[PDB]
Design a protein around this ligand. Sequence first.
Ligand SMILES: *[C@@H]1O[C@H](CO)[C@@H](O[C@@H]2O[C@H](CO)[C@@H](O[C@@H]3O[C@H](CO[C@H]4O[C@H](CO)[C@@H](O)[C@H](O)[C@@H]4O)[C@@H](O)[C@H](O[C@@H]4O[C@H](CO)[C@@H](O)[C@H](O)[C@@H]4O)[C@@H]3O)[C@H](O)[C@H]2NC(C)=O)[C@H](O)[C@H]1NC(C)=O
Ligand SMILES: *[C@@H]1O[C@H](CO)[C@@H](O[C@@H]2O[C@H](CO)[C@@H](O[C@@H]3O[C@H](CO[C@H]4O[C@H](CO)[C@@H](O)[C@H](O)[C@@H]4O)[C@@H](O)[C@H](O[C@@H]4O[C@H](CO)[C@@H](O)[C@H](O)[C@@H]4O)[C@@H]3O)[C@H](O)[C@H]2NC(C)=O)[C@H](O)[C@H]1NC(C)=O
Ligand SMILES: *[C@@H]1O[C@H](CO)[C@@H](O[C@@H]2O[C@H](CO)[C@@H](O[C@@H]3O[C@H](CO[C@H]4O[C@H](CO)[C@@H](O)[C@H](O)[C@@H]4O)[C@@H](O)[C@H](O[C@@H]4O[C@H](CO)[C@@H](O)[C@H](O)[C@@H]4O)[C@@H]3O)[C@H](O)[C@H]2NC(C)=O)[C@H](O)[C@H]1NC(C)=O
Ligand code: NAG
Ligand code: NAG
Ligand code: NAG
Ligand code: NAG
Ligand code: NAG
Ligand code: NAG
Lengths: 167, 167, 167, 324, 324, 324
Amino acid sequence: GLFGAIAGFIEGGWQGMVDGWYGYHHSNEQGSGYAADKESTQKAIDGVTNKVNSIIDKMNTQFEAVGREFNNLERRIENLNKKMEDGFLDVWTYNAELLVLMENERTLDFHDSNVKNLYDKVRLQLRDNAKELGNGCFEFYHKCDNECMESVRNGTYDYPQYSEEAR
Amino acid sequence: GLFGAIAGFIEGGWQGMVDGWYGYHHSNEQGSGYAADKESTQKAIDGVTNKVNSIIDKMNTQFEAVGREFNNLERRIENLNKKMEDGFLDVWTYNAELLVLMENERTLDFHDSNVKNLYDKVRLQLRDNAKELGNGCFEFYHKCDNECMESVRNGTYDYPQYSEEAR
Amino acid sequence: GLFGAIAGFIEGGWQGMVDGWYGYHHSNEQGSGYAADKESTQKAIDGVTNKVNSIIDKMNTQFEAVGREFNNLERRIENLNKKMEDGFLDVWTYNAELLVLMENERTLDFHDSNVKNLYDKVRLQLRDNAKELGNGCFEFYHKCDNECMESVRNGTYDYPQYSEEAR
Amino acid sequence: DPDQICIGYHANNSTEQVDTIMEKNVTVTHAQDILEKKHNGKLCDLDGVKPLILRDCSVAGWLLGNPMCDEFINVPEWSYIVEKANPVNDLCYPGDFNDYEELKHLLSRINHFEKIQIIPKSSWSSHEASLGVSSACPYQGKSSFFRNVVWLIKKDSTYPTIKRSYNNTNQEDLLVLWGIHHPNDAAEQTKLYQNPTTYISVGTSTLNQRLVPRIATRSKVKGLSGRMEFFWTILKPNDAINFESNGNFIAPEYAYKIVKKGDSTIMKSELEYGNCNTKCQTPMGAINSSMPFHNIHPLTIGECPKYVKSNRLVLAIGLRNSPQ
Amino acid sequence: DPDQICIGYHANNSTEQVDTIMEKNVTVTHAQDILEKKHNGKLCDLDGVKPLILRDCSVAGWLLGNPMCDEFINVPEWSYIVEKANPVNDLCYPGDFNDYEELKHLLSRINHFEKIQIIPKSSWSSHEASLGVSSACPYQGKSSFFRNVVWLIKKDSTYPTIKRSYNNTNQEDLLVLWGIHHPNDAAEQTKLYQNPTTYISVGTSTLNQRLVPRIATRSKVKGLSGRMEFFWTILKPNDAINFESNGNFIAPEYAYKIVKKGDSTIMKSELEYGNCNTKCQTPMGAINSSMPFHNIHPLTIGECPKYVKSNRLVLAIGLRNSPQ
Amino acid sequence: DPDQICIGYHANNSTEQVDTIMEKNVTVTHAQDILEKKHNGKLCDLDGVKPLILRDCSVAGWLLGNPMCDEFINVPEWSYIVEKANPVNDLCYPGDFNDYEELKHLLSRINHFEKIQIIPKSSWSSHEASLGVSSACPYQGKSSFFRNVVWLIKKDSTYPTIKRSYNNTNQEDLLVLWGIHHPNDAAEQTKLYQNPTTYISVGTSTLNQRLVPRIATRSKVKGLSGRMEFFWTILKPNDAINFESNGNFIAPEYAYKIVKKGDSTIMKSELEYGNCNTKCQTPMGAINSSMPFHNIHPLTIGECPKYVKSNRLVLAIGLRNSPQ
Ligand SMILES: *[C@@H]1O[C@H](CO)[C@@H](O[C@@H]2O[C@H](CO)[C@@H](O[C@@H]3O[C@H](CO[C@H]4O[C@H](CO)[C@@H](O)[C@H](O)[C@@H]4O)[C@@H](O)[C@H](O[C@@H]4O[C@H](CO)[C@@H](O)[C@H](O)[C@@H]4O)[C@@H]3O)[C@H](O)[C@H]2NC(C)=O)[C@H](O)[C@H]1NC(C)=O
Ligand SMILES: *[C@@H]1O[C@H](CO)[C@@H](O[C@@H]2O[C@H](CO)[C@@H](O[C@@H]3O[C@H](CO[C@H]4O[C@H](CO)[C@@H](O)[C@H](O)[C@@H]4O)[C@@H](O)[C@H](O[C@@H]4O[C@H](CO)[C@@H](O)[C@H](O)[C@@H]4O)[C@@H]3O)[C@H](O)[C@H]2NC(C)=O)[C@H](O)[C@H]1NC(C)=O
Ligand SMILES: *[C@@H]1O[C@H](CO)[C@@H](O[C@@H]2O[C@H](CO)[C@@H](O[C@@H]3O[C@H](CO[C@H]4O[C@H](CO)[C@@H](O)[C@H](O)[C@@H]4O)[C@@H](O)[C@H](O[C@@H]4O[C@H](CO)[C@@H](O)[C@H](O)[C@@H]4O)[C@@H]3O)[C@H](O)[C@H]2NC(C)=O)[C@H](O)[C@H]1NC(C)=O
Ligand SMILES: *[C@@H]1O[C@H](CO)[C@@H](O)[C@H](O)[C@H]1NC(C)=O
Ligand SMILES: *[C@@H]1O[C@H](CO)[C@@H](O)[C@H](O)[C@H]1NC(C)=O
Ligand SMILES: *[C@@H]1O[C@H](CO)[C@@H](O)[C@H](O)[C@H]1NC(C)=O
Ligand SMILES: *[C@@H]1O[C@H](CO)[C@@H](O)[C@H](O)[C@H]1NC(C)=O
Ligand SMILES: *[C@@H]1O[C@H](CO)[C@@H](O)[C@H](O)[C@H]1NC(C)=O
Ligand SMILES: *[C@@H]1O[C@H](CO)[C@@H](O)[C@H](O)[C@H]1NC(C)=O
């Protein structure tokens, strides 16, 4: 994908993370588990929902009565209606099919972006207090207990507290 | 946003930078101030301007005479015109509304991209002669006066000149 | 471009790499040369090909007979056909022109993305065993022969084998 | 073993697939279809006025009172007309209906409709009003005719010139129907109407009509080579219609008060009423959707989604999900 | 305190908002609207030929010379015709105009228009040319008639058969107008025209017409139960038109030279001329725009933006800006 | 010198340029055009049924058997009709053709077409069948007439009333053509047809027609002030057509069996047959494309790409390439 995270450097998804779209998995001496990033998940839900609603709500619907009211000596006028009808069918069919293909590309790239941004936010907090493995994971040079792991998820990780131990 | 800079790791915009879209703020013992990146600003102005002009200029306009010229015993033909007229109204309304929503998404992501790229260009020059704070700013390990700051904006920053002081 | 690689930090393309879209150039004591990344090239070929085919294949074509069958006292009906015909011409012209402009933007950004992702994949393998020059190139702190260069292209680069020499 | 934290994304057991511009058959965690494909299989009210469903009768047979059609039941208003493809009961006595398609279009949607007697059958003192019947138009095993018009013939070898006026005292437009009989030869002409050369003149504030019977040798339809040709007009409030004729006149007995606001059309369908309500009707069923597109039928009446030639329009909602 | 350099972006005091596909009400530093919503409130020339504005007259009244309409002023060319919704002056003597809508469409845009006398009023030696008047068509408090045609009647209890030809010696198509009078009964017929059974035959290279007066009892319109029915044709250069009649003939006096290149339509509007120029006219005003879309009115004439049902189409230009 | 590895992308010698939404004239390594601009310059079969190409004859001249047109060659089926803009041979004897445009539309695409004799020329025992000729319709330097109809005139100062029937015993619809002659005056009328007041009545199961000759003084066309007006109908299998007339009757000799499935139109083109096959025909040539768009011509017949006003639609395939 465009942003290189989903099915990219982050090679697959987590069946074990059931309560959100994006998040974290931690592993330390106390145990391991998955935690959803609530903020990024909700923003993504709001964005995709708005896109779908916009595709639906922006359609102008109005009353029309479609029948076949021309007789056997009005075939030229009947053909005029046929070309019009078929024309609109062609237009809406093409635009509907392409809209779906194009927006589906955008949605998946949107998810990819969100994951990449979450990754970068963690990377910048940790800096050199942890090793970037290349698979979505960071390997700490210091012990990071459940409270320390929470501070990373919170955006509250205190780098200068662990610097010396990292050395 | 898609690229994670604007209203992202760079949390807000600068009222104080009046002469461009993207740029730099420096702070040293000589003082502080804002400098626009002229090159990236002008490219962005050219790109967005071209998009708007394309949305306008690619429209084929041609002469048409729209009236109501059918009589009381030509209501079937009048209805045929109604369906045609309403059809085109529906098509152009939907496509105009979606085009605006979609291109507005692209424009904002374009700005985000430009900012991120400017950021990366500075990051790669500085490397380890400065600390990446995570908020769009770099904290120098050495003194960087106004001339040194200019070299960073210019893409002329000489890394090996400050290496020893950085240690 | 959006991803900052093509005509960005990677300032130009390689005439010398004839067998693929993206890849690597190496330089060591044994010599130098270009190697295409086959995997990323083929994925890109498949993606762009699918886009073009979709633009072509999703068109609904159907039989129509376009003539001028109304007489000198049926000019009002003739005008109705004119407005319809011109209307469809306007719609398809505008949508065809914009589709081309918009998808061309997407294609070029797609290539840019692919290059950036290939770059990042190498960066994460090498980490601090090589210096990031800022121009698309990495300068090794250790000797990297043809087999070592192949391991980088393969995604098989063994970092801990060269750590000590890198110091 | 050193501690680690990892960034990742949701996966689940979804096998739903979507297509993108660059890639087909992408399995995703959640998808949503925006194409309506479902209908209720019924003919419903439209917002929420019932349709006029004509069963086995055509609009013309219904209006004229073809005796082979069902008894006229009052329906004061309707949103659209449902006709079968080929109604078996149309014109029981063969012939033609002038500006028929425009009349059906005018009647497609009606706000108020009321049948009234404008010229009593019993008021024809100088003509025979109950001898105009045919085995082609039976009513209860007896030869009859269109029930809302009157096929007048001569009395005592005499057809005195008719001069009748009806004045629209009502506060609504009035649809008035009459006809002319085209006989087979001069012998039949004089046998039915005495006078050899005849006319029917009709005038309103706008109408200036004079009909004459055309003779021709014609093929038998339902056993008859004669033809009945019907006409109509809209009589404004406070305007009057004047008939004059010395033969071949199919006189009005009943006419119809009309209030018209909207217009719709004639739906061809074989379905019957479904005691439902909808905003969008097709001939094979109604659709109840907020979706932007549908693929059910092109001949729709109402506020409908856009009709497309597509089997599916599925948007991705969730993430790229590993397949089975 | 260590030195730093920071990367950032422009903000300002803009409260302008746009919508994106994923997010509504995004405040940006600069935006641009592509929907035209403004008009000048006037009827203008079209590129830059003036319209024919008919004030309180219909096309038919104007062409025929209805005396209740304003005096005929020469307008040699025009781009479109402006009629009020319901012109008070149409046919002063009640009746009908054959193929009226097609004629109005033909006349919508005209490159050259010139009224000429083709049959002088003073040339009717064997008929009375100045007795065909009605209180329905007053001209200066005196009973009159359509000024461009002549209502001929009998002289000395005689209506000799008329045989006139006009030959189009001009180098341009000629629009020719004539009519037939439908009286109320045979007594009126003979009173006006002597001969009881009458016709009007008209022939060109293409036209082969024979009209006869239809009698009917009709409602009074402006006090009259009679009817005038008008006809027209286009007489090619070097072709001639031949009239023959023994009654009921409304003869041409003037006809109109025509050069037609483009076609347009009839605009219904209550506005008057505005001494302006435009490329796109609507009935409530002209629009002067390079914008791709507009929402002013559907009944436009000219080269116009695409008509949409939208209150705003605002594109983002600048950056995501913090709101107030 | 330390070892290095670099990431990069392909460049080549391409000067091809594309436009993007944000940038014009971008040189790329490979591009692809999706606009069809090429045609073969020929009139071809359509999938793959040949067109009926009428050379210098109009549909009417072809059907009626205008002797100035080429000899009738059997073509059992066709996909569309090719007419020149202004066929020199149309109606050799001047006049009109009733519902001509609808007839041409009905005949545009035909599955089976076969000319048959329905009333032999030699069967008119009480009339003169070989005296109806004119110098206007020459056939081999001799005065003649439309070859598929018969201009009957009086024999021995007598025109006995005609009464003929043709019964459609064939298993296919039958297109039948007849006409009426409009003479110049009563002297010509009696000279040609004896009887002063005449009619032509025609009846089927649906048709109820009675024509009368209209007299008028008319301009000479090809030296003649008379007019021939032609009519037509579709005679169903097992139905019969009944003619009756005492003058002015242009009787059918041949009629045409028809099987109609699809409908198409009349193409105006000056090109001749090209012995080719195509799915999409334009008047300046056929196009053989899978492309979504084309800019060749709007008046196409077949399954064609969408017609646009564009000189090029070029998609980028490859990468941003340095220019020369
Ligand atoms: C169909 O519908 C109605 C039926 O009533 C009809 O309306 C009436 O039309 C007639 C037209 O002739 C008209 O009758 C005349 O009435 C005047 C006096 O009218 C005045 O008073 C009316 C009743 O109060 C009032 O409605 C009027 O506004 C008006 O102020 C009367 O003087 C006439 O008599 C004539 O004069 C001679 C004198 O020698 C009499 O001997 C002879 O009998 C004459 O007829 C005459 O009776 C009546 O006023 C109209 N009322 C209306 C419109 O409300 C419609 O006109 C009719 N439509 C058609 C197309 O036929
Ligand atoms: C309406 O417009 C014009 C009015 O001029 C008219 O054009 C003329 O049409 C008539 C048709 O009959 C024609 O008149 C004949 O002229 C010939 C000689 O014509 C030659 O010379 C002309 C003048 O210099 C020249 O224009 C012609 O091209 C041609 O070379 C004359 O011989 C005829 O006389 C006849 O012969 C007998 C002999 O016994 C006479 O006694 C008797 O008087 C006969 O009429 C006759 O006068 C004239 O030539 C046409 N000129 C044109 C077209 O320029 C249009 O035809 C007319 N249109 C309609 C539909 O009526
Ligand atoms: C055009 O096409 C065909 C031409 O054959 C025609 O079909 C025939 O139409 C006539 C209508 O009169 C009809 O003729 C009658 O036939 C009956 C007996 O018919 C029976 O046998 C037929 C032959 O085997 C069979 O086809 C029928 O289904 C039926 O079972 C005969 O009794 C009639 O004779 C009449 O009676 C008196 C008695 O006093 C005779 O003296 C006198 O001659 C009467 O005519 C008569 O001959 C025939 O049966 C029809 N056959 C068909 C439809 O297959 C179409 O009707 C015709 N179309 C038009 C519009 O004209
Ligand atoms: C998929 O998982 C959901 C959530 O646990 C469950 O409700 C559903 O039944 C599962 N379906 C399968 C395994 O087919
Ligand atoms: C995508 O799936 C459909 C069946 O649902 C299949 O027919 C089609 O060929 C598939 N395409 C690819 C590229 O797998
Ligand atoms: C916004 O700022 C601009 C530029 O300084 C100024 O011209 C404008 O008047 C300001 N408007 C406000 C504060 O409303
Ligand atoms: C966006 O703004 C409009 C008022 O301008 C408001 O009515 C609408 O509800 C807003 N939507 C949101 C999500 O704030
Ligand atoms: C461009 O390069 C290709 C591949 O080597 C070659 O085939 C082609 O002829 C070249 N064209 C030029 C230099 O114009
Ligand atoms: C792009 O190229 C065309 C010629 O092919 C030229 O006319 C046009 O002005 C160019 N535009 C720019 C911005 O270079």
